[PDB]
Amino acid sequence: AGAALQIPFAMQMAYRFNGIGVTQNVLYENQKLIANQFNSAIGKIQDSL
């Protein structure tokens, strides 16, 4: 929607969680669990493919 603007990644997942009704307080308290779950899921999808 114009010119690209730099933004840290964590403060993008915060906005995306805020979008779907889950308040952003959740993300900053459980960041490591989310990272581990995402990495495990991507490994699983690579293995399945």
């Binding site: 929607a1 114009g2 010119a3 603007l5 840290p8 964590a10 403060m11 915060a14 906005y15 952003q24 307080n25 900053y28 308290e29 960041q31």
Partner: protein, 109 residues
């Protein structure tokens, strides 16, 4: 609300016009420009507790900390009405020390 359905950028309205064998839409779109640089922080620690912004984002030109909306620049002093508290800050990554001003104490005197 679906992006890029009507125009390149945020959408405001459309006007229809006739044509020989078709229709012509004039979309009105809103596009920002003249950007800047800033240093951010996800939360503010005060008195051992954490403070997060209600709707906005924390910025700081280098000396003072403000909260501004995402799509435009209009800094405001960090008060206790546009921020909310959630627990104590020892696990968040990116906390920065500061003071959060409140109006009740000055209005009390």
């Amino acid at each position: 609300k679906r992006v890029d359905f009507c125009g390149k950028g945020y959408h405001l309205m459309s006007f229809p016009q006739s044509a020989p064998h078709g229709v012509v839409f004039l979309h009105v779109t809103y596009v920002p420009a003249q950007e800047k640089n800033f240093t951010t922080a996800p939360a503010i620690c005060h008195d051992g507790k954490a403070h997060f912004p209600r709707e906005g984002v924390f910025v700081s030109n280098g000396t003072h900390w403000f909260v501004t909306q995402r799509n435009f620049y209009e800094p405001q002093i960090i008060t206790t009405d546009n921020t909310f508290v959630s627990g104590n800050c020892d696990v968040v990554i990116g906390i920065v020390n500061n003071t959060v001003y409140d109006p009740l104490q000055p209005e009390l005197d």
